[PDB]
Amino acid sequence: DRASKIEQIQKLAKYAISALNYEDLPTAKDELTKALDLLNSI
Amino acid sequence: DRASKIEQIQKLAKYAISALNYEDLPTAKDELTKALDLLNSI
Amino acid sequence: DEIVNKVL
Amino acid sequence: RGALSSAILSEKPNVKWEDVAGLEGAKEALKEAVILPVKFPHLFKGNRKPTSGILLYGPPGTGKSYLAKAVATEANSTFFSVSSSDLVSKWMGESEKLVKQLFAMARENKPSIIFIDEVDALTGTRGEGESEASRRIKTELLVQMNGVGNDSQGVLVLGATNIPWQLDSAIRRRFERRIYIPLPDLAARTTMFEINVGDTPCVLTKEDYRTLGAMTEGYSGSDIAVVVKDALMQPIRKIQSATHFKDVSETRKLTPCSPGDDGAIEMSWTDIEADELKEPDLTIKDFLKAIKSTRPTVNEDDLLKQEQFTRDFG
Amino acid sequence: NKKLRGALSSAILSEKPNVKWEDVAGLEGAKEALKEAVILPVKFPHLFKGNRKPTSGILLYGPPGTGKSYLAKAVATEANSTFFSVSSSDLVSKWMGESEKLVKQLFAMARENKPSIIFIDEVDALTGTRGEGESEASRRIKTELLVQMNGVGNDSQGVLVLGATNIPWQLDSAIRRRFERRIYIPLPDLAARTTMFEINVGDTPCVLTKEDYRTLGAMTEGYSGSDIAVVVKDALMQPIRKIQSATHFKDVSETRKLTPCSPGDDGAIEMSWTDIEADELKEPDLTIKDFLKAIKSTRPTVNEDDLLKQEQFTRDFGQEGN
Amino acid sequence: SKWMGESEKLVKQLFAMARENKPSIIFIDEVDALTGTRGEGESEASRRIKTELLVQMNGVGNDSQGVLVLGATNIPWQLDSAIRRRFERRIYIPLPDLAARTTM
Ligand SMILES: Nc1ncnc2c1ncn2[C@@H]1O[C@H](COP(=O)(O)OP(=O)(O)O)[C@@H](O)[C@H]1O
Ligand SMILES: Nc1ncnc2c1ncn2[C@@H]1O[C@H](COP(=O)(O)OP(=O)(O)O)[C@@H](O)[C@H]1O
Ligand code: BEF
Ligand code: BEF
Ligand SMILES: [Mg+2]
Ligand SMILES: [Mg+2]
């Protein structure tokens, strides 16, 4: 289960990166957050 | 700057990902943070 | 040489 | 002559009897049909004759051709791995002399075991087939496999198939021990993981291989050979995907590590010198990664028709 | 012997279709598997020793028009290996078991010229589950392909067998077994579609921005990469339609240059394109109503139950091409 | 054709004729009788003539430069989706209207 959460955190970070490639700060500040909160949920 | 700040977040969020590949939550929770704060600094 | 045809 | 003597192999694929996992009945029958006549030839006199035909059948990917390679290493015979490409011809009256030549050179080279692999492609029920290829091949082969008393050295005719119900009933008769090679159970799967990792440095224990063998029910031996293939690739993913290595320990040796660690320089594998790379160890998350990605091969109605044939003839 | 090599001399292709790994849009996973099965054994051959062997079969499947043959062209450019491209026209001969003697000769050539790649395009036309097929073509071409791929005395070292298909559920289970990484090439997502518009317009002068390509990529959900290649084809024809329907042109700005303008404008002469001199024409740049025009006219190609059987096969036997 | 895989070296050398004499036009009249969705058809005719037409129209080593492939049909819904893909402008010819009838 923890391995699954870690995979999801990494996915969200990858999606955030991909987002900044269009300067989309909105998406970014969000995914890079949904991710962080989850690394604390670990 | 900015064009770079936006580039350094990604640099961070990558390291963070790379870090979770050793389950290193410490580094992660940090880089994924130094990054986020900076996206607000934008 | 014995060649093959093909049917329906 | 010089057209069928491309059936003899000579490279001896080094598979020994302790590499097939499980299948003990099949090893038992193959030993008492291959090893034992040569080692104690005085026993087979009178009414006691050796076996002269063995059919292996099963679902796809379970061990048939591989066990034939094991026989090809361990037999000390002369081994003809003939197939339908090497017997059929344009000119009429060549697919008579070709089979006839095959068995005559098998009796040049006694003891002989002949491996007609996938016999359903030679022998196709002869109600729809063409004149030359289907009829004279299958009749001549039936004759020459009616050598019961004369073939006391030499020809043991193996054969493997995946569709054993599409086989002609006269040829179902000639193969006198139809053995069924099934999907493997727990001890065999654990044995196959322990074999296929080889001598690769891994942190795994007996309970780890036991765990994976418990995890993989439904897989054949091919599938476990490819999850070990993919899981052995997993270190090179953990070297290509690298931003940061680190020295450990014969002069300099660096391995991938997380961003910011004890001696964590920032670089790529490309930056690092020949050899002086420290290839990462094999975890259990590598195998769990591979087992998540790889998905089984046999479908559970193919097994119903296999069990059908086993219950009717096998 | 040499009659047969005289037949198969026309399969060793010799022109290197210039598609590079960035001309493919999307598909991280399929490029990743293909790189670590094609590029990496040649570039670092010391690694593959012991138990670590390279992959020897890769099946790509998907809906029509999503990238399969194109990604095979990318391999054909980047591989530095001999790239045989064979098909059903070149294996079915007329003559009692040449369709087995040809196959055996094919892999014998691809072992004498290792490292090699064999790309069997539309493998579902050779390999058809053998429950209804005819004796010769069915049992003998399928059987020689089986025995020749792994077999006993055969040694599939250093050959790779690709293969693409659109009907992956009509494939024989022994040949589903031989292809050991069934990767699925799907319809593109949002970022991929935006990338394909940016690629296919090329270096053509257009007034479009990133939010314009982003708009079109948001507009086209359901399209494969073929369809977006043809809406870019049609939208690149739109300046010609302007420059023919132009009663009236006008000079603007290297010596004289005229473009279509409405009746009665600043320097609006009345003429036809025919009246105007070689080169000294100025064609209206790609402006977003051209693309909206094309997207209104062009309609998807794949339906939405074909996708159900594709997702079926992916959930029962397949990888995920991302 | 009759002799076993002659019915696709015909397809191949048709398109090779049109490449030797480009700019060429190939007009396949009534295409729904060659190309029948391949889920019920027979092995040779179905998979091999349809498949060689597919691979030959775009394929890998094939170069459809300067050839044009027309085609007409009355049953356009019985057409295989790969061949619906290859025909890149499906135009619809309808029953006439007033000015057209007066012109005729
Ligand atoms: N009993 C087994 N022991 C070891 N490996 C096995 C066994 N069965 C299958 N395998 C693995 O699967 C591979 C495929 O075996 P193969 O001969 O192709 O099976 P078959 O002919 O029944 O389909 C073997 O070469 C090996 O990689
Ligand atoms: N993923 C893609 N990225 C870039 N171009 C693509 C992609 N998919 C399709 N195309 C374009 O669409 C055409 C169709 O690709 P093609 O290889 O023929 O597809 P396939 O063989 O699956 O049907 C290609 O020539 C290319 O021009
Ligand atoms: F059982 Be295998 F596919 F020959
Ligand atoms: F090869 Be395509 F997907 F028609
Ligand atoms: Mg086998
Ligand atoms: Mg294609």
Residue numbers in the entry:
A (entry chain I), B (entry chain H): 289 to 330
C (entry chain G): 165 to 172
D (entry chain A): 116 to 364, 369 to 433
E (entry chain B): 112 to 364, 369 to 437
F (entry chain C): 204 to 307
Quote the original article.
The Endosomal Sorting Complexes Required for Transport (ESCRT) pathway drives multiple cellular membrane fission processes through the formation of filaments comprising different subsets of related ESCRT-III family members. ESCRT-III filaments stabilize highly curved membrane necks that resolve by fission when the filaments are remodeled by Vps4. Vps4 is monomeric or dimeric at cytoplasmic concentrations, but forms a hexamer when active and recruited to ESCRT-III filaments. The Vps4 N-terminal MIT domain is followed by an ~40 residue flexible linker and an ATPase cassette that comprises a large ATPase domain, small ATPase domain, and a β domain.
